[PDB]
Design a protein around this ligand. Structure first.
Ligand SMILES: [Ca+2]
Ligand SMILES: [Ca+2]
Lengths: 228, 302, 155
């Protein structure tokens, strides 16, 4: 703590992304399972790149997932599936860590929609109840099998999704129900509202922009735009 | 052809079935020839897939409005991004075509709209707020918020506009009064005994927004949304959800309250503008609001 | 009361009289039950003295009885630069709002418009023109005018 805060923020998880760090770390894990980190703990500049290439075209063969740069939504969704995990199992030389990471991604699927929910107290209370021991086994496996990497370094996303999620849902009642995403959606309004209904002098421009935006976002005027 | 004849010839040739319908209706439906022939022609059209003609006929009888409510008129001006001069030209056209004032003209549309923005729905506060004027009819406040133009100091250049928090809140709540009254209908709770304990949960959001692209680069959009309303009467009542919002992420319900042409990064100007809203929200969580909804004045916490 | 009933119920209650009208139409007007009951309604209204409604009804049958000529509808799409999905949303609105079909829908709009573009109306030419095609239906011709795309020449 080094700066005088002035904005009371409920320090909540952002349900929107909430996943991309987990997915890119599963990517690095699978790339280090094509490689051997716990046999070759000092890979060179290009072993990793060849491993990424064979993994990527391997997925291209089975799951038909062309290479990417960054984990957007749909790519991330398709990457975390039992079938893609058994697909990468084809290439890993040993078969013990095969079943290890299989159970890993299994528990991952079991605990995933717990955070993207709207009210798991009624949508999926089973996954909430099992979540404690679920994430516990998750951490246990990540330590016993993968501690070649998580000795000192962790991505923030991992910590937030492993530590407090059930406590968060208990304290508030949901996770998705406060996603900032909504307001970010609203951006495509503002900019375009600038274009067609300008005034247009900056002393006045905001007046009309705000007027019209508010007009848009009222229950009253939508309740007439029923179209059953 | 029968429809090519005169009234005399049609009468002469159809008096037979006229008397048949007469005796049938007097037997069953009290002789109401009007409603009988109406329903008969309707069913005759519906068998021929003529939904359009039958629908317009039923629009001729009970009811026969021709009047478009100025509320929907405004919505359709805005909800589909029609510009204003556009709207006036199209109105002149739809009038000059067919004989009816189907789209209420511009100025009355604006007047009808004016009742919906902030600064029209009176209210009181117990107690009066901290360091806030009791004025309640002030509309769009210039966001600069009284900045001495003297260029000796930090520039007063930054452009921004915003409402007042409380006025926007009373606007949104008088907007949703319909749904809260419907929830009191469903929940079947008392009415003369549900006027004190309302709990409104509100979610804020302030995100950066870059580069409006045109031929004025950065911007912030400080917006909030009603999230849930519950009751506090009368025992422990751990939770009595009057209404939980259904699409809290759908942008269709996320209303803006402040906007500035500042950078997301620099702490200085962002604070210098947002300060007012901070002080409001802080001094707000304590006192309680009194609003006239459904004829009854009722109290609200936050 | 007959009016507030359902279509099933109204059909059930009126079936007998409807068969009487059906056989009457077969015997006299060849099953044109539609025009027969229409004339019944017209004269029953003109007996009721609300002749405004009788004139409107006659304006419906054989008139432009869909509310508004689709031609002016297309003009108001274009003559104020309105977009297309724009138009459909607006149409949804006006339809659901007040009980009537005022704005003609999309596909009928386009099909009714298609006559106005060039290349629709058969004609003839005396004499036939010099080195000009014989067709008259072709619409928007690509202005390239058939260039051999071969990148050896000017492209
Ligand atoms: Ca951002
Ligand atoms: Ca952003």
């Amino acid at each position: 703590v080094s700066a005088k805060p002035f904005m009371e923020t409920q320090p909540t998880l952002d349900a929107l992304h909430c996943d991309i760090g987990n997915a890119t770390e599963f990517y690095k894990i699978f790339q280090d399972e094509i490689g051997e980190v716990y046999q070759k703990p000092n890979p060179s500049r290009e072993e990793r790149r060849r491993w990424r290439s064979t993994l990527d075209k391997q997925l291209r063969k089975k799951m038909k997932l062309k290479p990417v740069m960054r984990m957007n939504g749909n790519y991330a969704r398709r990457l975390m599936t039992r079938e893609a995990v058994e697909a990468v199992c084809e290439l890993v030389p040993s078969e013990e860590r095969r079943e290890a990471l299989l159970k890993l991604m299994d528990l991952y699927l079991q605990m995933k929609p717990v955070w993207r929910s709207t009210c798991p107290s009624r949508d999926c209370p089973d996954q909430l109840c099992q979540y404690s021991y679920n994430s516990q086994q998750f951490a246990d496996l990540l330590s016993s099998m993968f501690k070649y990497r998580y000795d000192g370094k962790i991505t923030n996303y991992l910590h937030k999704t492993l530590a407090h999620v059930p406590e968060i849902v208990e304290r508030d009642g949901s996770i998705g129900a406060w996603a900032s995403e909504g307001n970010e959606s609203g951006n495509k309004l503002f900019r375009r509202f600038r274009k067609m209904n300008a005034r247009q002098s900056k002393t006045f421009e905001l007046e009309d922009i705000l007027k019209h935006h508010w007009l848009y976002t009222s229950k009253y005027l939508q309740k007439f735009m029923e179209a059953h | 052809h029968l429809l090519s004849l005169t009234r005399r010839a049609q009468k002469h040739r159809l008096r037979d079935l006229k008397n048949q319908v007469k005796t049938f209706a007097e037997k069953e439906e009290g002789g109401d020839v009007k409603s009988v022939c109406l329903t008969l022609f309707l069913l005759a059209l519906r068998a021929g897939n003529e939904h359009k003609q039958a629908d317009e006929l039923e629009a001729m009888m009970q009811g026969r409005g021709f009047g478009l409510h100025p509320a929907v008129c405004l919505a359709i001006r805005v909800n589909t991004f029609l510009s204003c001069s556009q709207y006036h030209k199209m109105y002149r056209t739809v009038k000059a075509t067919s004989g009816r004032q189907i789209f209420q003209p511009l100025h009355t549309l604006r007047n009808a709209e004016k009742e919906l923005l902030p600064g029209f729905h009176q209210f009181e506060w117990q107690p009066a707020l901290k360091n806030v004027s009791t004025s309640w009819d002030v509309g769009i406040i210039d966001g600069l918020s009284g900045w001495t133009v003297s260029v000796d100091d930090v520039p007063a250049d930054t452009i921004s506009r915003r409402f007042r928090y409380d006025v926007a809140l009373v606007s949104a709540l008088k907007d949703l009064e319909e749904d809260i009254m419907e929830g009191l209908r469903e929940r079947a709770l008392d009415d003369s005994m549900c006027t004190s304990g309302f709990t409104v949960v509100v979610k804020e959001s302030c995100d950066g927004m870059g580069d409006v692209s045109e031929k004025p680069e950065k911007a912030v959009r400080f917006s909030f949304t009603i999230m849930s309303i519950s009751i506090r009467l009368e025992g422990e009542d751990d939770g009595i959800t009057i209404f939980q919002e259904q699409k809290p992420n759908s942008e269709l319900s996320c209303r803006p309250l402040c906007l500035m042409f500042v950078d997301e990064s620099d702490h200085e100007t962002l604070t210098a503008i947002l300060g007012p809203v901070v002080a409001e929200r802080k001094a707000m969580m304590e006192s309680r609001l009194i609003i006239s909804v459904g004829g009854l004045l009722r109290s609200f916490r936050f």
